[PDB]
Amino acid sequence: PVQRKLDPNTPFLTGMRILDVLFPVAMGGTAAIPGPFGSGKTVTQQSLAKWSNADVVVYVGCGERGNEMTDVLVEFPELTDPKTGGPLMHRTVLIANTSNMPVAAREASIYVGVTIAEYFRDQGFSVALMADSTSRWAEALREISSRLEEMPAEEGYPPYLAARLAAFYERAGKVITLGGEEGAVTIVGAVSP
Amino acid sequence: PVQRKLDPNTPFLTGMRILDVLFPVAMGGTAAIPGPFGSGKTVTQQSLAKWSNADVVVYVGCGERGNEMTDVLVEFPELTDPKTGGPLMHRTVLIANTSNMPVAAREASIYVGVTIAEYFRDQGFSVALMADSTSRWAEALREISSRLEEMPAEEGYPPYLAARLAAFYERAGKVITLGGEEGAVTIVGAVSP
Amino acid sequence: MIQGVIQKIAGPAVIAKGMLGARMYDICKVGEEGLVGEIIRLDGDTAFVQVYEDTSGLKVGEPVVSTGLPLAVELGPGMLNGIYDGIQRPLERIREKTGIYITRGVVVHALDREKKWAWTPMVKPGDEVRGGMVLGTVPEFGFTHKILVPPDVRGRVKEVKPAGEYTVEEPVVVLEDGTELKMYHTWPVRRARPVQRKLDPNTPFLTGMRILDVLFPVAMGGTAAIPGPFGSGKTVTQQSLAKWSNADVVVYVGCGERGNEMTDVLVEFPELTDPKTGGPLMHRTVLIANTSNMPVAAREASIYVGVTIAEYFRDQGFSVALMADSTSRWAEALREISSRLEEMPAEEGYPPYLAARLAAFYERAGKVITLGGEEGAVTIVGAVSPPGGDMSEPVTQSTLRIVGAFWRLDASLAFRRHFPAINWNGSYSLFTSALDPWYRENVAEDYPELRDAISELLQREAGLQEIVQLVGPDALQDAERLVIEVGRIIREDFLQQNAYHEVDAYCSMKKAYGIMKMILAFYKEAEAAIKRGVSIDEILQLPVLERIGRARYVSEEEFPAYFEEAMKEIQGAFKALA
Amino acid sequence: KKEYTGITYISGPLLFVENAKDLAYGAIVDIKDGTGRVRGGQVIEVSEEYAVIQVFEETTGLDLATTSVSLVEDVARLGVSKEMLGRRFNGIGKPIDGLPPITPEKRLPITGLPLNPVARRKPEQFIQTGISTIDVMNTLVRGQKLPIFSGSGLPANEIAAQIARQATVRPDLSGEGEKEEPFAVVFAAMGITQRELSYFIQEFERTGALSRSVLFLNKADDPTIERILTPRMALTVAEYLAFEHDYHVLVILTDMTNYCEALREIGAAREEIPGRRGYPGYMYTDLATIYERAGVVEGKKGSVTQIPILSMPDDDRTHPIPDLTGYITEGQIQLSRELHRKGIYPPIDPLPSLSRLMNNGVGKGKTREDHKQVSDQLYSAYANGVDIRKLVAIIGEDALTENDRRYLQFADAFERFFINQGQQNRSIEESLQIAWALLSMLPQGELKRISKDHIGKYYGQKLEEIWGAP
Amino acid sequence: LLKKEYTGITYISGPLLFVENAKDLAYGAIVDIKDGTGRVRGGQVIEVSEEYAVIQVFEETTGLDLATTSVSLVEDVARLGVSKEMLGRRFNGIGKPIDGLPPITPEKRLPITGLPLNPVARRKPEQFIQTGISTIDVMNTLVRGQKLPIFSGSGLPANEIAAQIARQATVRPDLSGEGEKEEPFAVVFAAMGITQRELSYFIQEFERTGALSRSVLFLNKADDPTIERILTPRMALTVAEYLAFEHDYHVLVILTDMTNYCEALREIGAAREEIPGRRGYPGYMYTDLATIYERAGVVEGKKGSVTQIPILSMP
Amino acid sequence: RRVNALEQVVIPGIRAQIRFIQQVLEQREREDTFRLKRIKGKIEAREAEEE
Ligand SMILES: Nc1ncnc2c1ncn2[C@@H]1O[C@H](COP(=O)(O)OP(=O)(O)OP(=O)(O)O)[C@@H](O)[C@H]1O
Ligand SMILES: Nc1ncnc2c1ncn2[C@@H]1O[C@H](COP(=O)(O)OP(=O)(O)OP(=O)(O)O)[C@@H](O)[C@H]1O
Ligand SMILES: Nc1ncnc2c1ncn2[C@@H]1O[C@H](COP(=O)(O)OP(=O)(O)O)[C@@H](O)[C@H]1O
Ligand SMILES: [Mg+2]
Ligand SMILES: [Mg+2]
Ligand SMILES: [Mg+2]
């Protein structure tokens, strides 16, 4: 719960010229970055994790490769965050669920990440959340619906996928917390069509 | 029942240049006018009702707007019959079943219209029958067959749709009535794909 | 065996009860009329049997009897000179006993039970027998039909019948175990016959058609496919292969074609003559014929019967060529059968196991060492007919993944009366490397280099088509006009053939080598004369040029003198007049 | 005799009857109710507990208390005789001409038996249809299956009536002349309207063509099972006549699209999973059982010839109904909408037309020996002219050469005279004469496909003969 | 341990048979089906409940009947016996020899499914591998521990490129320093749906080069039953993982054609009445493909590595 | 230039569009077949509730 929601009015600085000048995103907004394989979604999200001005960064590796998590685990302790001067890993929380892990755990990882990000919002910080792929979550929903033997809507997906996606993205925004402080959560989700 | 059928040898004058010149329709024949929404089926059928050389016109509003039936109810008493010389509403019979009216009554509306048109044929008149949309009839059949739990045909329609459509169009023709007189029914049916 | 009664009839699907003990994919005789069908599903005490023929007129309560065996064929003497349907029913005896119509429930036997054969034993009591060994020989036309033990039988010989006249139903050798061996045995048509070892193909399959066996050859035991849009010359090529090839036994399979097309092959074949012996062509052929209105199960199982017969004749030690006509019709029959079973389709309505079946059919070919210790080979040539001529059709895609040779046709060359209308650009063969040692040891030591040179000369002609399409064909320089003219000569005298002439229908390798040598020598001397400087119209007029055209019609044993005469003539005209 | 009264379920076109295990599958039954009406039905499923009956026409007055079912016949049969020549039937054998029913010489099942492939012989004799673009370029051989492809508005019915009215055999060209040949026409129309029915009746009654013809006419508002049964009855009559009295029958099927749609409806009513594009998976075999009943039999003098007529749903040749017909039949005849809108009747387009058995019917001894070369030269010249006509509109007529303008004249003269014949009846000699007259406008040496012996005998004739009344 | 047999077969249709009173059958277990003739088929439990168990058969179901057929239990988890002496041997894709040599003795029995690697336990692939091809080693260089597929065509020489890479693969420990030592190398080769001609060409190339002495071949022909095509890459990856992570070998895994694997997966999935995907392929094909490609890489604190080069053709 | 532009740009795009539309229509047909199979199974299972 929150007290009130506020209009986003300060930019979220990502460190990339094209995303900061031409297509900006605010401090409580949501962004979607779709593309085919090899386009550069993961590199963009990791650059956002490295260089943005958010206080706390929560990265959700939903259904992707395991090397992309080992690179973050290895290279981050040797980097310096832009605003406090300490190690970069001291402000990062990783939720990892790779592609060869059980499928039904993909759905829970998104909710765990967004709940942790909301918890850090209640303390007054500005939190940036990166979801690595939502299409894997959609695939997990399709698998569960197929096991339940429900009638699909399109491409085998259950008809309530849009409601789940809207419920996930609506948790972002700049609010006034119950303690009287100001907090913010931004969500950048990547789609793999 | 009738006594005998007759060859089509007399045009059904509609007052439209392209229809009456390039694509004529006889007194006992049938025609169809399909097209997407906003292309002019209702305006064409209303012009046919206004300007044709038929003695009696039966208009069937199967599953269409109520504003068009209000337009017909208001404008027609102020017009003049081309041949009788009196008001235009004295030769017209309207059958209305709007889109918000109950679904199951659309087939009844079509059959009532065609039966009344057959009745006016037996008195020696030449009747014109306009069906506003026969696609809503098929949609009603699909809706009922959904509750019947039948095995559907292509696109979900019941398998007996073609028989009903054929049996509706075969009632038209230029006949010799049981009393020895001569009458005809011409049917124009719009399709909304 | 298991007996039951009918419980429910619904079209071709029949449910029988009391059939406990029946086995999956057995053959059942349904009803009192004797209709046949498979068992496709067992359930409790009931069995789902799918009848091949029409079930109209049947009643609930009629008996159903299971034969206890799956679909099989009888392999033995008498299969040669025969005409069979998709499930091995002799059509000639059906016509003799029924008339012009094929009535349902007709009962016939694949092998004639009343014909006597001269038995020549080759074993003695006390001998050991294993699968594939030879029990005896029996004369049949020009061959010696080796009577073989079935592959699943081993034991010791107890008693052997002496030489005499017997039928196929009488035992000739009885084992000590009590097993009685006749002249024939049955084998399931869906299971491959065992072999000792598969070999590597290195001997060519002599087609007799010059472009095929020169530019895109196929080896013994290899596989090939020949597709094409609509009428492109497919049937003439396959019957030419039937006549003029070096295969001892030819198996022709017609998978659900038009009735008049079956009439053509059924009437024209009994008039041809075998080039090897001079006797009738039908004395070494087995024909499988199915029209479109024949039952879909027979059309689907048509190719397996032919491949089983080919495997049997390979096991006897011969070399067999199997021609399957229009495998697309077989794929259509398979699609219909899958549609009757309510299976989820893939691609253009085909079942998702089409590639598995196509691989299972084509993998049976190859040169092997038989279980009796002899060599054998099966060669498969399968025609495909894509619907619109598109080569992206799933049947063509599945076939192209496994065939070693791929001869593509088109009707554009048929317009110009250029036969055989093989696209020399789109076609290819993967047997060229392995067949070269045979060519150099048995034809000529310089055959592959010369063939590669001629292929390069053909390739050089194609690259100039971007110039002749804009500029006229006469406004070119000498070095281009010469190669254009020699390409036209090659196309109209080497890549063209007729099979209605005695000295051209069957082309030996030495003849083709000589013609190729003459063409290359003419081109080389013309280029050398062009280097010296001469008008190119003189090159297109010199009388030696006609000897290339008239080298096709010399007799095969008359050829070498003609070749030497041309080789000495060509050295004369081009040195003085140029 | 025995009646079944255990009706337990009525819904749409089906009804279930209990304790009906004496009914054979596929039998024909009678459904009688309290009001005295009698309806027909066909058993589609037989079980130990009940049987399923599909009812002809509607099921309005039925009820579960008074309905009773009685068996009529185990196998659907048709009573045939030689008196059928000149009679009209409704599609299940009932006369509709007001004449009393015939006395049957035999009763035969309507489902066919496959011909033995070793019992057939090659077709070698042609049929004169009276249309130049068919008799010359796409010759129809006795024993051939030759479909006709048309669109929504093209005149297929008029062409069918004209072909049925004009077709005959030509024994005088067959050797020394042979003798009298019996000829007959079997006309089967499925799913036609009242206008087409009246037109067909008038056309067959106004010239005496009814005296040698049998008509099977099924209307659009008739039950669909009759539409399924009609072609099998027509082919049964044709086979009986041809192979028992040495007739040369000619079967014309008016609309195979209606048959395919009725098959789809029947399959849907029995709860079968459809195949490609909603059509049944066994449509290939069902179509093959109809087309493959034509042919000529060794040892017999009669023959059966079929001209199926089908309308492509969207002028699409990749639709399943035109696609499967191409695999079974030998060639096709395609009507063109351009020639129809340009005022040319019959609108037969020669370029996409093809007959695959023409080479066995042309030649000396059965027709004139210049048939094949004339047809090939006409095809090539028309193919050149149609492209030259399109190039003219861009580059102009003066920019052409002389032979280009000669071909440009030949193309439109050909379209105006050879094709646009109207209601004429042309013998093969007339069509060959007109074809030679059209080729005479081309210079000598341009006719590469014709031997010089024919050129020295037939070249150089003027076109003004047919010009008298085109 | 003494065996237990079930005779309660109640329904056979297509590739599925139902077994009654099968409470003590574990999920995913391997069963042996015997009929009256004594022939033995393979099968796997795919659904178990209180009333019956559902078993899919590894091959055709001809000859089965509800009277004489019996089902026995082989093992609850499918396992493969592995040993160091497999180097130089050939297998059919199910674990049985095809070169005529005596069968190997199992050092260990490992599950062929495998287990996911902990992302913490991994490390960065950081070593260059010289392939012997110029266009690879410069612009698209291959690193030890990478999964680098080759996108081929329908008439393009991919098999020859794979054979050349397998012949010329080296470690080159000179330029980054590394250990400057002679290091063992191995190649594990798996072929699915291969033809006789390609089989002969592959074995001839491996024999002529001499690389067969350090290789293991899992060769599956196109006429084999389709289940043996499914299990083929899993056994090869099990052998590669065992070698690399228990004997410090730098193994290289080559998968000849993934398209045949995908078509076999589609054919298997369509027989279990599941919702199709984009082109008729099953909807879980991403997970099934991921369980194969994710078994390569390097492990922190160990010397071995696994490198995968799959080859596939684009239709 | 016009000939090359047509043959190199216009035709392949139309071919790709045709292929894409064919794939979409085939997928929709397959989904319809699956739905019909499911409801046929439901109809068959309804009658077996109490025999
Ligand atoms: N900003 C960038 N600067 C330099 N190179 C880049 C950049 N973005 C992407 N690349 C290159 O392109 C590759 C794309 O890899 P990346 O993981 O970012 O792609 P992706 O779209 O997330 O892929 P996938 O869908 O497979 O997860 C990188 O490995 C790198 O080589
Ligand atoms: N003959 C005409 N002359 C002038 N305007 C016309 C004519 N026909 C149509 N229009 C215009 O186009 C509009 C089309 O609306 P209309 O009600 O005719 O559509 P419709 O095809 O019957 O659609 P619906 O599917 O909604 O019933 C008319 O409201 C009018 O503005
Ligand atoms: N080698 C050849 N010699 C002579 N004629 C040939 C040869 N190859 C093809 N043809 C001609 O090509 C034509 C093709 O006929 P056909 O085989 O029936 O075509 P398709 O079987 O493709 O429909 C035949 O009429 C035949 O005369
Ligand atoms: Mg990524
Ligand atoms: Mg309107
Ligand atoms: Mg052919």
PDB file of N, CA, C and O and ligand atoms in Angstrom, chain C residues 209 230-237 240 261 409 414 419-421 497-500, chain D residues 356, ligand 3:
ATOM      1  N   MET C 209      21.036 -43.416 -71.187  1.00  0.00           N
ATOM      2  CA  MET C 209      20.706 -42.059 -71.600  1.00  0.00           C
ATOM      3  C   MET C 209      21.921 -41.178 -71.345  1.00  0.00           C
ATOM      4  O   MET C 209      22.394 -41.088 -70.208  1.00  0.00           O
ATOM      5  N   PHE C 230       4.097 -30.961 -64.268  1.00  0.00           N
ATOM      6  CA  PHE C 230       3.122 -31.477 -65.244  1.00  0.00           C
ATOM      7  C   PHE C 230       3.852 -32.332 -66.281  1.00  0.00           C
ATOM      8  O   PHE C 230       4.737 -33.115 -65.908  1.00  0.00           O
ATOM      9  N   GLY C 231       3.530 -32.215 -67.567  1.00  0.00           N
ATOM     10  CA  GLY C 231       4.138 -33.047 -68.583  1.00  0.00           C
ATOM     11  C   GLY C 231       5.512 -32.572 -68.999  1.00  0.00           C
ATOM     12  O   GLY C 231       5.644 -31.547 -69.673  1.00  0.00           O
ATOM     13  N   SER C 232       6.549 -33.316 -68.606  1.00  0.00           N
ATOM     14  CA  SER C 232       7.923 -32.948 -68.918  1.00  0.00           C
ATOM     15  C   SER C 232       8.740 -34.120 -69.449  1.00  0.00           C
ATOM     16  O   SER C 232       9.945 -33.966 -69.670  1.00  0.00           O
ATOM     17  N   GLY C 233       8.124 -35.278 -69.663  1.00  0.00           N
ATOM     18  CA  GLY C 233       8.846 -36.438 -70.143  1.00  0.00           C
ATOM     19  C   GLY C 233       9.217 -37.450 -69.086  1.00  0.00           C
ATOM     20  O   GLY C 233      10.187 -38.191 -69.276  1.00  0.00           O
ATOM     21  N   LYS C 234       8.478 -37.506 -67.977  1.00  0.00           N
ATOM     22  CA  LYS C 234       8.827 -38.424 -66.898  1.00  0.00           C
ATOM     23  C   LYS C 234       8.592 -39.875 -67.298  1.00  0.00           C
ATOM     24  O   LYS C 234       9.444 -40.738 -67.056  1.00  0.00           O
ATOM     25  N   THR C 235       7.445 -40.162 -67.915  1.00  0.00           N
ATOM     26  CA  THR C 235       7.066 -41.546 -68.182  1.00  0.00           C
ATOM     27  C   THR C 235       7.959 -42.176 -69.245  1.00  0.00           C
ATOM     28  O   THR C 235       8.286 -43.366 -69.167  1.00  0.00           O
ATOM     29  N   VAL C 236       8.362 -41.394 -70.250  1.00  0.00           N
ATOM     30  CA  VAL C 236       9.216 -41.925 -71.313  1.00  0.00           C
ATOM     31  C   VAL C 236      10.594 -42.275 -70.763  1.00  0.00           C
ATOM     32  O   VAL C 236      11.193 -43.291 -71.136  1.00  0.00           O
ATOM     33  N   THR C 237      11.114 -41.435 -69.864  1.00  0.00           N
ATOM     34  CA  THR C 237      12.418 -41.700 -69.264  1.00  0.00           C
ATOM     35  C   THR C 237      12.403 -42.976 -68.432  1.00  0.00           C
ATOM     36  O   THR C 237      13.338 -43.781 -68.503  1.00  0.00           O
ATOM     37  N   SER C 240      12.180 -45.973 -70.661  1.00  0.00           N
ATOM     38  CA  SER C 240      13.480 -46.159 -71.297  1.00  0.00           C
ATOM     39  C   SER C 240      14.471 -46.800 -70.335  1.00  0.00           C
ATOM     40  O   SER C 240      15.289 -47.637 -70.738  1.00  0.00           O
ATOM     41  N   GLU C 261      -3.624 -43.873 -68.128  1.00  0.00           N
ATOM     42  CA  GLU C 261      -2.178 -44.006 -67.999  1.00  0.00           C
ATOM     43  C   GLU C 261      -1.770 -45.416 -67.592  1.00  0.00           C
ATOM     44  O   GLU C 261      -0.728 -45.906 -68.041  1.00  0.00           O
ATOM     45  N   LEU C 409      13.553 -31.558 -64.163  1.00  0.00           N
ATOM     46  CA  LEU C 409      13.017 -31.376 -65.504  1.00  0.00           C
ATOM     47  C   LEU C 409      12.260 -30.058 -65.607  1.00  0.00           C
ATOM     48  O   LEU C 409      11.928 -29.418 -64.605  1.00  0.00           O
ATOM     49  N   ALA C 414      11.130 -28.852 -73.461  1.00  0.00           N
ATOM     50  CA  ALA C 414      10.154 -29.620 -74.225  1.00  0.00           C
ATOM     51  C   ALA C 414       9.502 -28.768 -75.305  1.00  0.00           C
ATOM     52  O   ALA C 414       9.086 -29.296 -76.342  1.00  0.00           O
ATOM     53  N   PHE C 419      14.936 -33.155 -75.922  1.00  0.00           N
ATOM     54  CA  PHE C 419      14.697 -34.268 -75.024  1.00  0.00           C
ATOM     55  C   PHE C 419      15.975 -35.073 -74.838  1.00  0.00           C
ATOM     56  O   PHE C 419      16.716 -35.296 -75.805  1.00  0.00           O
ATOM     57  N   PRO C 420      16.262 -35.530 -73.610  1.00  0.00           N
ATOM     58  CA  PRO C 420      15.487 -35.352 -72.368  1.00  0.00           C
ATOM     59  C   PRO C 420      15.608 -33.942 -71.796  1.00  0.00           C
ATOM     60  O   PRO C 420      16.679 -33.344 -71.808  1.00  0.00           O
ATOM     61  N   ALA C 421      14.509 -33.394 -71.277  1.00  0.00           N
ATOM     62  CA  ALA C 421      14.452 -31.991 -70.871  1.00  0.00           C
ATOM     63  C   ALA C 421      14.969 -31.807 -69.442  1.00  0.00           C
ATOM     64  O   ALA C 421      14.265 -31.351 -68.542  1.00  0.00           O
ATOM     65  N   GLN C 497      18.765 -36.463 -77.244  1.00  0.00           N
ATOM     66  CA  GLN C 497      18.753 -37.883 -77.549  1.00  0.00           C
ATOM     67  C   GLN C 497      17.356 -38.311 -77.967  1.00  0.00           C
ATOM     68  O   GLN C 497      16.354 -37.749 -77.516  1.00  0.00           O
ATOM     69  N   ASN C 498      17.306 -39.314 -78.839  1.00  0.00           N
ATOM     70  CA  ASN C 498      16.074 -39.989 -79.205  1.00  0.00           C
ATOM     71  C   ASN C 498      16.256 -41.487 -78.999  1.00  0.00           C
ATOM     72  O   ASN C 498      17.332 -42.040 -79.248  1.00  0.00           O
ATOM     73  N   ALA C 499      15.205 -42.138 -78.507  1.00  0.00           N
ATOM     74  CA  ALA C 499      15.243 -43.565 -78.225  1.00  0.00           C
ATOM     75  C   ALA C 499      14.449 -44.390 -79.226  1.00  0.00           C
ATOM     76  O   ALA C 499      14.233 -45.583 -78.992  1.00  0.00           O
ATOM     77  N   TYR C 500      14.009 -43.791 -80.329  1.00  0.00           N
ATOM     78  CA  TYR C 500      13.300 -44.510 -81.377  1.00  0.00           C
ATOM     79  C   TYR C 500      14.221 -44.976 -82.495  1.00  0.00           C
ATOM     80  O   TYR C 500      13.745 -45.580 -83.462  1.00  0.00           O
TER      81      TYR C 500
ATOM     82  N   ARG D 356      -4.993 -34.019 -73.014  1.00  0.00           N
ATOM     83  CA  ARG D 356      -3.844 -34.905 -72.900  1.00  0.00           C
ATOM     84  C   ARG D 356      -3.988 -36.197 -73.692  1.00  0.00           C
ATOM     85  O   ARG D 356      -3.023 -36.963 -73.772  1.00  0.00           O
TER      86      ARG D 356
HETATM   87  N1  LIG G   3      14.311 -39.700 -75.087  1.00  0.00           N
HETATM   88  C1  LIG G   3      13.205 -39.333 -75.778  1.00  0.00           C
HETATM   89  N2  LIG G   3      13.047 -39.679 -77.076  1.00  0.00           N
HETATM   90  C2  LIG G   3      11.954 -39.321 -77.773  1.00  0.00           C
HETATM   91  N3  LIG G   3      10.941 -38.603 -77.254  1.00  0.00           N
HETATM   92  C3  LIG G   3      10.968 -38.188 -75.965  1.00  0.00           C
HETATM   93  C4  LIG G   3      12.129 -38.542 -75.136  1.00  0.00           C
HETATM   94  N4  LIG G   3      11.906 -38.017 -73.918  1.00  0.00           N
HETATM   95  C5  LIG G   3      10.706 -37.385 -73.959  1.00  0.00           C
HETATM   96  N5  LIG G   3      10.147 -37.489 -75.178  1.00  0.00           N
HETATM   97  C6  LIG G   3       8.840 -36.920 -75.584  1.00  0.00           C
HETATM   98  O1  LIG G   3       8.286 -36.143 -74.519  1.00  0.00           O
HETATM   99  C7  LIG G   3       6.884 -36.392 -74.387  1.00  0.00           C
HETATM  100  C8  LIG G   3       6.505 -36.474 -72.914  1.00  0.00           C
HETATM  101  O2  LIG G   3       5.446 -37.411 -72.727  1.00  0.00           O
HETATM  102  P1  LIG G   3       5.103 -37.983 -71.261  1.00  0.00           P
HETATM  103  O3  LIG G   3       6.263 -38.823 -70.787  1.00  0.00           O
HETATM  104  O4  LIG G   3       3.718 -38.580 -71.300  1.00  0.00           O
HETATM  105  O5  LIG G   3       5.043 -36.660 -70.347  1.00  0.00           O
HETATM  106  P2  LIG G   3       4.700 -36.757 -68.777  1.00  0.00           P
HETATM  107  O6  LIG G   3       4.868 -38.215 -68.430  1.00  0.00           O
HETATM  108  O7  LIG G   3       5.723 -35.860 -68.126  1.00  0.00           O
HETATM  109  O8  LIG G   3       3.282 -36.250 -68.689  1.00  0.00           O
HETATM  110  C9  LIG G   3       6.597 -37.698 -75.109  1.00  0.00           C
HETATM  111  O9  LIG G   3       5.528 -37.513 -76.039  1.00  0.00           O
HETATM  112  C10 LIG G   3       7.866 -38.054 -75.853  1.00  0.00           C
HETATM  113  O10 LIG G   3       7.604 -38.154 -77.255  1.00  0.00           O
END
